[PDB]
């Protein structure tokens, strides 16, 4: 299929109307970030020649 | 098949036709002794950085 970007949401804009929140949600989200790699050492003489 | 390694007793039960043993990286880590029908693990000789 041809992918859809997102659901369409036409915001009801007018020159004298505002939307004010009456409530709130305390939302906890996860962010995973790599920090380090495996520290690998290669003996060049032993690798090439044994 | 020549090489240099420590030959220890093995817990791998070989099939009667198989003689050699390889790990993931295609290196021979197990062998069957031709004189006595027993299985030996080859651990590589101790090495490390100084
Ligand atoms: C604020 O008012 C606007 C206009 O009356 C609302 O917008 C309409 O909402 C209905 C409800 O589903 C939709 O069917 C219409 O298509 C919307 N019109 C437009 C131009 O967007 C809006 O929902 C109201 N907001 C609140 C929080 O009550
Ligand atoms: C704001 O939203 C919260 C939801 O997070 C509402 O809390 C709920 O209230 C109902 C009715 O009192 C309870 O049955 C739910 O168990 C409540 N949820 C939680 C998570 O406590 C709160 O009442 C809303 N406030 C307003 C003014 O709309």
Ligand 1 pocket residue status of A19, Cβ below 6 Å: yes
Task: Check if the beta carbon of residue B43 is closer than 8 Å to that of residue B10.
Answer: no
Give residue for tokens 């020159």. Answer: A15
Q: How far apart are CA B39 and CA B10, in angstroms?
A: 6
Q: Which residues pair with B40 in a beta bridge?
A: B9, B31
Ligand 2 pocket residue status of A23, Cβ below 6 Å: yes
Q: How far apart are CA A16 and CA A44, in angstroms?
A: 73
Q: How far apart are CA B33 and CA B19, in angstroms?
A: 8
Q: How far is the CA of A11 from the centre of ligand 1 (A)?
A: 8
A6-30 core/surface letters (b: 16 or more CB in 10 A; e: else): eeeeeeeeeeeeeeeeeeeeeeeee
| φ, ψ at B40 (rounded to 5°) | -125, 140
CA distance B16 to chain A (A): 32
The structure was resolved to a resolution in Å of 2.7
Handedness of CA B30, B34, B39, B42 (dihedral sign): negative
Q: Which residues pair with B9 in a beta bridge?
A: B40
Report how this structure was experimentally obtained: cryo-EM
């Amino acid at each position: 299929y041809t992918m859809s970007l997102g659901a369409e949401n036409s915001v009801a804009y007018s020159n004298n109307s505002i939307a004010i929140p009456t409530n709130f949600t305390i939302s906890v989200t996860t962010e995973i970030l790599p920090v380090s790699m495996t520290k690998t050492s290669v003996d060049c003489t032993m690798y090439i020649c044994g | 098949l020549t090489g240099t390694g420590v030959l220890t007793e093995s817990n791998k039960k070989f099939l009667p036709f198989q003689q050699f043993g390889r790990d993931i990286a295609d290196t021979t880590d197990a062998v069957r002794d031709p004189q006595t029908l027993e299985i030996l693990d080859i651990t590589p000789c101790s090495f490390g950085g100084v």
